[PDB]
């Protein structure tokens, strides 16, 4: 699934991300803009092996099994595909597990060097929420 920008900030309030450890949902709608476009069939592989899944590009290296990540963990208990359902769920519960592991929304390079500081309103900006 595709989803819009105001579609997913209601997506991602609905399931309780909005203000999740101190985040406001601009934050987590700029974070899946630059991870996925909001496609939630997005995948890419890392250098290493591990490949990131969904709308919140989320790591088999820690966060859920693929079977072909040697040595990774399954943090959050689920098959990666989870990660790539129309319905966030699963990746919703994940992320907020990773922003819970001590650097916020660090662990999200893209969030790092494209959200971060910037003025993340604009994403939620006209949306009915
Ligand atoms: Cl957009
Ligand atoms: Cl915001
Ligand atoms: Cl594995
Ligand atoms: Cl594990
Ligand atoms: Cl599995
Ligand atoms: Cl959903
Ligand atoms: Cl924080
Ligand atoms: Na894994």
Redesign the pocket.
């Known amino acids: 699934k595709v989803f819009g920008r105001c579609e997913l900030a209601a997506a991602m309030k609905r399931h309780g991300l909005d203000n999740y450890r101190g985040y406001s949902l601009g934050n987590w709608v700029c974070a899946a803009k630059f991870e996925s476009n909001f496609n939630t069939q997005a995948t890419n592989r890392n250098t290493d092996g591990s490949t990131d899944y969904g709308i919140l590009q989320i790591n088999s290296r820690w966060w859920?099994?693929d079977?072909r990540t040697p040595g990774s963990r399954?943090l959050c208990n689920?098959?990666?595909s989870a990660l790539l359902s129309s319905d966030i769920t699963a990746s919703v519960n994940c992320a907020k597990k990773i922003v819970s592991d001590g650097n916020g929304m660090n662990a999200w390079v893209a969030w790092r060097n494209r959200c971060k500081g910037t003025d993340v309103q604009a994403w939620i900006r006209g949306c009915r929420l």
């Open positions: 859920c099994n079977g399954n689920i098959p990666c």
